[PDB]
Design an enzyme around this catalytic site. Structure first.
Site, PDB file in Angstrom:
ATOM      1  N   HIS A   1      -2.289  -2.450   8.678  1.00  0.00           N
ATOM      2  CA  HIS A   1      -3.459  -2.749   7.857  1.00  0.00           C
ATOM      3  C   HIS A   1      -4.205  -1.492   7.405  1.00  0.00           C
ATOM      4  CE1 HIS A   1      -6.885  -4.924   6.322  1.00  0.00           C
ATOM      5  NE2 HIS A   1      -7.701  -4.303   7.157  1.00  0.00           N
TER       6      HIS A   1
ATOM      7  N   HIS B   1       0.715  -1.277   0.000  1.00  0.00           N
ATOM      8  CA  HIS B   1       0.000   0.000   0.000  1.00  0.00           C
ATOM      9  C   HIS B   1       0.748   1.336   0.000  1.00  0.00           C
ATOM     10  CE1 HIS B   1      -3.526  -2.512   0.607  1.00  0.00           C
ATOM     11  NE2 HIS B   1      -3.008  -3.001   1.720  1.00  0.00           N
TER      12      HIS B   1
HETATM   13  N1  LIG Z   1      -4.976  -9.778  10.033  1.00  0.00           N
HETATM   14  C1  LIG Z   1      -5.781  -9.119   9.229  1.00  0.00           C
HETATM   15  N2  LIG Z   1      -6.615  -8.128   9.717  1.00  0.00           N
HETATM   16  C2  LIG Z   1      -7.482  -7.407   8.910  1.00  0.00           C
HETATM   17  N3  LIG Z   1      -7.613  -7.576   7.596  1.00  0.00           N
HETATM   18  C3  LIG Z   1      -6.801  -8.549   7.088  1.00  0.00           C
HETATM   19  C4  LIG Z   1      -5.869  -9.367   7.779  1.00  0.00           C
HETATM   20  N4  LIG Z   1      -5.227 -10.239   6.950  1.00  0.00           N
HETATM   21  C5  LIG Z   1      -5.733  -9.989   5.743  1.00  0.00           C
HETATM   22  N5  LIG Z   1      -6.699  -8.964   5.775  1.00  0.00           N
HETATM   23  C6  LIG Z   1      -7.515  -8.372   4.647  1.00  0.00           C
HETATM   24  O1  LIG Z   1      -8.471  -9.392   4.175  1.00  0.00           O
HETATM   25  C7  LIG Z   1      -8.686  -9.199   2.711  1.00  0.00           C
HETATM   26  C8  LIG Z   1      -8.432 -10.537   2.012  1.00  0.00           C
HETATM   27  O2  LIG Z   1      -7.110 -11.097   2.454  1.00  0.00           O
HETATM   28  P1  LIG Z   1      -6.489 -12.138   1.376  1.00  0.00           P
HETATM   29  O3  LIG Z   1      -6.809 -11.779  -0.034  1.00  0.00           O
HETATM   30  O4  LIG Z   1      -5.043 -12.321   1.579  1.00  0.00           O
HETATM   31  O5  LIG Z   1      -7.171 -13.335   1.704  1.00  0.00           O
HETATM   32  C9  LIG Z   1      -7.797  -8.001   2.328  1.00  0.00           C
HETATM   33  O6  LIG Z   1      -8.469  -6.778   2.196  1.00  0.00           O
HETATM   34  C10 LIG Z   1      -6.713  -8.046   3.433  1.00  0.00           C
HETATM   35  O7  LIG Z   1      -6.049  -6.771   3.572  1.00  0.00           O
HETATM   36  P2  LIG Z   1      -4.815  -6.439   2.545  1.00  0.00           P
HETATM   37  O8  LIG Z   1      -5.362  -5.807   1.319  1.00  0.00           O
HETATM   38  O9  LIG Z   1      -3.874  -5.510   3.204  1.00  0.00           O
HETATM   39  O10 LIG Z   1      -4.092  -7.685   2.190  1.00  0.00           O
END
Ligand SMILES: Nc1ncnc2c1ncn2[C@@H]1O[C@H](COP(=O)(O)O)[C@@H](O)[C@H]1OP(=O)(O)O
Length: 134
Positions: free
Chosen positions: A129, A16
């Protein structure tokens, strides 16, 4: 799934933070390399890591997407952004994904936590995040 070799703060910057990003199709390759399917949408904040760290040090608020967490912080000013939108969903392989580039400008809300031992000791609290943009 974040690749284990990177801390939460490092993966946040990789996904990001970018002052002058290249075309989305090019920037996203490094991120999709570690996934099973191409990411549907990704947003790059056109600012510096140092500036986000400062946002961390301000007023704390409950995270919009998960109110049980009171570790979020909203930027005081709107910042330019680059949204990367996936064009071929489910279609083409995770090896040939193309994205559309879309400029935008708004406030952002990040969740911040204590740094990982592998992170720079310079910053005790770091962004981990991107909750949302408004
Ligand atoms: N520990 C976490 N807490 C909050 N959101 C998360 C966490 N891990 C992943 N995400 C978010 O969940 C969504 C799907 O994750 P993924 O595609 O890997 O399965 C994305 O928007 C991701 O944010 P991010 O866009 O920063 O990766």
């Amino acid at each position: 799934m974040r690749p284990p070799q990177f801390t939460r703060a490092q993966w946040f910057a990789i996904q990001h933070i970018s002052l002058n990003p290249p075309r989305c199709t090019i920037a996203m390759r490094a991120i999709n390399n570690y996934r099973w399917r191409c990411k549907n949408q990704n947003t790059f904040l056109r600012t510096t890591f140092a500036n986000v760290v400062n946002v961390c040090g301000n007023q704390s608020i409950r995270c919009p997407h998960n109110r049980t967490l009171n570790n979020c912080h909203r930027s005081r000013f709107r910042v330019p952004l680059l949204h990367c939108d996936l064009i071929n969903p489910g279609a083409q392989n995770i090896s040939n994904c193309r994205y559309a580039d879309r400029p935008g400008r708004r406030f952002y809300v990040v969740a911040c936590d204590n740094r990982d031992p592998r992170d720079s000791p310079r910053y005790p609290v770091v962004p981990v995040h991107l909750d949302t943009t408004i």
